[PDB]
Design a protein around this ligand. Structure first.
Ligand SMILES: Cc1cc2nc3c(=O)[nH]c(=O)nc-3n(C[C@H](O)[C@H](O)[C@H](O)COP(=O)(O)OP(=O)(O)OC[C@@H]3O[C@@H](n4cnc5c(N)ncnc54)[C@H](O)[C@@H]3O)c2cc1C
Ligand SMILES: Cc1cc2nc3c(=O)[nH]c(=O)nc-3n(C[C@H](O)[C@H](O)[C@H](O)COP(=O)(O)OP(=O)(O)OC[C@H]3O[C@@H](n4cnc5c(N)ncnc54)[C@H](O)[C@@H]3O)c2cc1C
Lengths: 264, 264
């Protein structure tokens, strides 16, 4: 394997090769890897950082590519750009990049690594040896672009026909139009209904809505995520308030132990 | 070492980051390696190829960077562009590149590798194991840009305070103004007069000229290159006619055996 991210401390300027508008505020930003034969080299569960100086300050933000190490030659980021009404500087930077412009990628980073077959290696910190535990059910609470760390895991699980792990995604977004990667998710769900449960909640639901509405709550966690247990791991990725006010307290009320919860 | 050229079959698009006019027809074309920490990974004696499609045809040409693996982050090519009277498509392509444009580099390539300490490993072909031989004297006949493969070796030798190899360069150019990298060469010669002998010949000499004039001939080879012998290797890099009509027959008349001559 020609690995792009050979050194986690290296900032690899990768050229933007295409920008694709996916929705009113999200897009696919594809960057060329060092050669068409390269793969990113991003363990499942980890992310990369984009960094560049914006208005004189180094801006470094995490992104979990929606591409995988099966993809050669490019890395695909699904990025939400924040159109007004904290800064969204990096997405805006990406938004303003012209094709061929470079931005620095670094990685892999992340305290959690899905080793496959339900095995998650989670490090207390960068310097700690991961605690490896095998679970059978991975609950995933994603808010908006927090879907990418989840999708990376889901896809890893699902592409392994021998991975019996069942992923339960509770995907929260502002509105139906904001359900990022819905087609991707639903196809995964349609094709792997046994190992992938999918549920949505939107802050504002359309008049006709078959899913949940509102911030994630206990009921959604209790009913759309696996129950607390030694074989359950809950993963979370979403806005800080989502984590702090919609996830943590309800996971607690549902009974999910902090140690069987991981937040990207 | 973060090696750029990890795979010889890979075409690494490197961004042009600097274009520097060196003379009326030569330039430094500096390309960024994958990261500022990368080195090219180019064994001494070898070259890289630049390749890109020019007017619908793949154009792949050899270049020996004047940078070395001591240089991190960039590769420096000294390239002669061919202006008004051969095809020079690649140099013209480079000439026409805008900063940030990429061109594909591949390598290392070359049947000769200087292993240091007078040791040259020369392969009959890419599939043959190199014949390693230690010489004490390396005669070098370079015509124009053919100086780069020589300079790479000269610098490698001179860089090593324990390399006793003496390099004798017979550098041919069309005119004094065409003596590519003269300042570099003369500084090397000035600082390592013991292991670096330098002689020039120019097709057309200026009114005041202390060196040779005309195509390389027997006398120049006899008197400015080490004598034929088991401890002598003659390297050549120049235009085909220089090789065929000024080098080979005179090397032969001087007595340098084909096996102790190598043409880049
Ligand atoms: C391994 C390799 C690496 C290379 N690296 C580079 C590089 O770094 N940069 C780059 O620009 N190119 C590079 N080249 C291209 C190569 O250096 C040039 O093709 C050729 O070697 C020299 O070109 P020129 O125009 O510089 O020569 P000129 O300037 O034409 O001339 C040198 C000529 O050599 C002799 N000569 C020329 N024509 C004749 C003739 N008809 N009869 C007799 N003697 C003659 C003369 O002494 C004269 O001064 C490389 C090629 C190889 C194979
Ligand atoms: C490891 C990592 C990887 C990342 N990868 C990417 C990536 O690939 N692409 C990218 O664009 N970003 C990425 N990010 C940024 C991250 O996805 C977004 O910062 C973060 O999780 C939320 O985005 P959001 O704007 O989409 O939330 P919004 O759309 O604001 O919202 C989403 C949802 O979460 C809940 N929520 C929001 N606000 C509140 C509140 N006040 N109270 C309660 N619940 C609330 C709601 O359910 C809401 O629908 C990453 C971040 C990390 C840490």
């Amino acid at each position: 394997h020609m690995i792009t991210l050979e050194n986690p401390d290296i900032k690899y300027p990768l050229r933007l090769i295409d920008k694709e508008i996916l929705s009113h505020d999200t897009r696919r930003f594809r960057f060329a890897l060092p050669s068409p034969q390269h793969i990113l080299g991003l363990p499942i569960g980890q992310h990369i950082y984009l960094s560049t100086r914006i208005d004189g300050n180094l801006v470094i933000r995490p992104y979990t590519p929606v591409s995988s190490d099966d993809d050669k030659g490019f890395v695909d980021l699904v990025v939400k750009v924040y159109f007004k009404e904290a800064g969204g500087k990096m997405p805006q930077y990406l938004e303003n990049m012209n094709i061929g412009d470079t931005i620095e990628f670094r990685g892999p980073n992340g305290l959690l690594v899905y080793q496959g077959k339900g095995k998650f290696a989670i490090r207390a910190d960068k310097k700690s040896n991961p605690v490896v535990r095998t679970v059978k059910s991975v609950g995933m609470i994603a808010g908006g672009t927090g879907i990418t760390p989840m999708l990376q895991v889901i896809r890893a699980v699902l592409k392994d026909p021998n991975d019996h792990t069942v992923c339960y995604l509770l995907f929260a977004n502002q509105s139906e139009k904001d359900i990022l990667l819905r087609p991707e998710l639903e196809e995964l769900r349609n094709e792997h209904s046994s190992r992938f449960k999918l549920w949505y909640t939107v802050d504002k639901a359309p008049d006709a809505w078959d899913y949940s509405q509102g911030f994630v709550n206990e009921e959604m966690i209790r009913d759309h995520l696996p129950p607390p247990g030694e074989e359950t791991l809950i993963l979370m990725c979403g806005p800080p308030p989502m984590i702090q006010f919609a996830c943590l307290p309800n996971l607690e009320r549902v009974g999910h132990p902090k140690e069987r919860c991981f937040t990207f």
